[PDB]
Design a protein around this nucleic acid. Sequence first.
RNA 1: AGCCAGGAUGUUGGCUUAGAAGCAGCCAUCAUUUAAAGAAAGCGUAAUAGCUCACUGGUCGAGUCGGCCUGCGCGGAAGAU
Lengths: 141, 38, 176, 286
Amino acid sequence: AKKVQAYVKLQVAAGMANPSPPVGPALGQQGVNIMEFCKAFNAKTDSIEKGLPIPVVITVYADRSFTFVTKTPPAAVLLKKAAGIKSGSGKPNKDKVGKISRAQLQEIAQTKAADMTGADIEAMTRSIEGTARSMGLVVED
Amino acid sequence: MKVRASVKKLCRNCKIVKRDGVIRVICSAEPKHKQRQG
Amino acid sequence: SRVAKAPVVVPAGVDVKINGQVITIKGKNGELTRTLNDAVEVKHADNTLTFGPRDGYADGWAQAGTARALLNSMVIGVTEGFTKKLQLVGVGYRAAVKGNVINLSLGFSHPVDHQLPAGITAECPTQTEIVLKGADKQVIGQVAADLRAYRRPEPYKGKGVRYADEVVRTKEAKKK
Amino acid sequence: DRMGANFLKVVNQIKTRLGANPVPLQLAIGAEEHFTGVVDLVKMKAINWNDADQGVTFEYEDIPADMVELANEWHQNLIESAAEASEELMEKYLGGEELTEAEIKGALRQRVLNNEIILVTCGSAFKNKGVQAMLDAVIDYLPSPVDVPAINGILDDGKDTPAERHASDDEPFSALAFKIATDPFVGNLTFFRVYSGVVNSGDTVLNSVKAARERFGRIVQMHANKREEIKEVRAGDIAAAIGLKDVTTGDTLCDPDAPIILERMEFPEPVISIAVEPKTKADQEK
RNA sequence: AGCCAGGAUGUUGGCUUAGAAGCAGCCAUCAUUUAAAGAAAGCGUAAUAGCUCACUGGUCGAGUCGGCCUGCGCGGAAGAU
């Protein structure tokens, strides 16, 4: 949409109301009331069981305005939400633990298909196979 | 201006121009990176 | 070259006096003349000025490459002008214009009031901002840089006299 | 009398950083080096000061001609400051009854018991420019011990009944203990201030918060330095409650069968801790 | 080589998460779009907001660029009636 003024996509798990210090600056860019971004998203945050980093983007406007785009959580954390542990990448090509087939990957891609125009089904399938091999995970169908 | 026999282009944005014959190397933000001899 | 692909277009309102090597430009508010070197072949051809490097002085591509940039600035300097603003950041430091004289509240035991030459119409909107106006590009810097050299930008506070567009690099104490 | 010393900047900087509401009164005449006048705005009079003497003149004149309009636009904000202090001056700011020097202070003095506005004054201490000016506001903008709420001794533990006692000599005695210095003559000393009541010389002054008995010795007043023996302490003097056996921070100095205070608020914490070590082994004994 | 010029945007890139959130460092080192973009070079920095390299995506509208070999030149080069 917009241009060289501001465009950063950063939001982490929305159970924490206070802007986490490293996220702070993406809210510390164009003069927000930080209570506004706390009161914008919580009307829909009560339709979730919190625990995963959900992303939003920030985008700005002239006087004191701003805007933001809501999407669904990415499949990268959805790989390690089902797998139990949040960080598995210790050795990529030397660990063979943990299987999920393609059927789980497409049903977490329909929620991408019902939300976004990129991150398409069949193209991300090798990168949701590619985030498996870097973590040291196996896949079979 | 520090003096030494070696003018080595050290800082990432280091200008080199031959003022009076003796080389002195021009940085932008670092005064420490400026030598003059050689 | 790039300079050979750069001719300058004199407009109406600035008259040239081509006595060969000596050109005296009759302009809007002044007389911006430069007595160039003999490594140039000058001709105000139709309206757009064309130049040339003389033989023998084949390094006159440099010596007239100065000149192509030179006279372009002269015809636009005698008419429009240069705004050369300086930013006085000093504890108790003021600036005020009277006639052609500038005060210098410069933290000394005695005042410094230096008279400024022709080609200068100076102004001061406040104690920290000071206009300089002029016709030559050299004289609009030379009288400006002398003030700045009396109190250089101090890189521990940001203290000093500094230009409008100049951005200092102030450091931190880090010991005590 | 310094460079960069803008009076109107600093008082209008409080409304930005401190967030308060200052309406200043004594303004400035002079370009800080030929400075001669301090512009009192109620009486609209500038004051001449000493050529360089340590204190000769007090010569009041009119507003000078070089500041005839800045006195105009700032006096009209002075006389605003009573229409929104008391509700009764609201209808004579607009009706146009005269706002004299004496009438406006009767509202603004009651604006010091709530403290929404502070009263500001520019001048020099060292150049003897303003010090003789600054004293008349103290009797008219700083509160007296008989104009304030006086000693309010509550009780002990029975019931919360805060009791405004009298500021005159017609009460049981009361004081407080603070600035309790030392000396190699008598040992412990105090810089105590009595709020009301009169004590004679020689008394069984207790400290009723910590259950100890003390006797009242030879009380001594100072010029902040020199021993002057104050025998009869009147209500409102500041002296040295000498000869206290034990005394803590802020307990009462009071005769029994009287009201009693028990108050110690905001006990501090000295933070930086350094360990002192003796030089000789005879030193650690001392 | 400069002025406009997006720095297309999956991601928080883990670990150990206290921040080691492209910018501390070890293993991977795929890329949803590939007419412009790397799981990355420094500065801003606890982290990032700010500013770029990346392709120059659109303008100028011609030459230009980094090294190898030799002819010579400069610096290196300060001493004592």
